[PDB]
Amino acid sequence: SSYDWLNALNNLELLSLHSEILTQLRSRGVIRTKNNPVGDYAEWLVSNALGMTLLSNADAIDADGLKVQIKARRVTPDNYEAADFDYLIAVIFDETYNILDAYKIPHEVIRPRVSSIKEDLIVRSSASVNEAAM
Amino acid sequence: SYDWLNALNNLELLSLHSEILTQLRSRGVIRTKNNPVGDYAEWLVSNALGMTLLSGADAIDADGLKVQIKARRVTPDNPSRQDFDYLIAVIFDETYNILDAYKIPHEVIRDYIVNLKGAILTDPRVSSIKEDLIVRSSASVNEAAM
């Protein structure tokens, strides 16, 4: 909830804490690499919530066998593909990683036909997380 | 250490991860959210040696030469050590203390993906700059990297 206490850490403590977090997430299987943690988390969220299988390194195959792209973005004050997939799922997080929006974008949409999946993703992800905690 | 991280949920871990990076960006230590170990290396070498960071080359040094800056943190998984005038290569241990820091002229890279092992480190055109980083850094920075 609160992060002003970060002001009291030195840069080396922040950096060591940062890596321990990524070690913790990797050990839980939430992120598969240290390179893009927000993207890896979205992929873990969407795959578990919607019954998709992740691909190592399309990002996933869904429950009907379609090829899916998963991209994520976090809202703050601060600032082609030539590969085939059937649709993109785009997740937008707030500062504390609550889902602001989630979009299903068929590949055909380039540069309307895209629909929100926000409610379905939140519901099935909340069931997923609470179930796993058991 | 930070064993209390085990008591957080994944949403809290990621929120903290992003707030840490925002804190570092606000201090000018990290410049982008993508390469924090590399951005820290650049902050370290630039402040120690009086370089200006660029948004091809990563920095201009105090004599106007173009510098590439690369960093690596050695972890339990592996300890492998793998237009610009020279490259500066920093190697951190797990807790971000500097194991080694090398100055590698572009000419040396041509003659040799570069492996900081064996003959490249004994090439007279290559120098360690760890000692220079320690001397020339401020006592505030130096107290972190002892």
Residue numbers in the entry:
A (entry chain B): 7 to 63, 68 to 89, 100 to 131, 155 to 177
B (entry chain A): 8 to 62, 67 to 93, 104 to 133, 144 to 177
What did the study's authors say about this model?
The BisI family of restriction endonucleases is unique in requiring multiple methylated or hydroxymethylated cytosine residues within a short recognition sequence (GCNGC), and in cleaving directly within this sequence, rather than at a distance. We present the crystal structures of NhoI and Eco15I_Ntd (N-terminal catalytic domain of Eco15I) in the absence of DNA and in specific complexes with fully methylated GCNGC containing dsDNA. Both proteins are homodimeric, with each domain involved in target sequence recognition and catalysis. The crystal structures show that the modified cytosine bases are recognized in the context of double-stranded DNA, without base flipping.
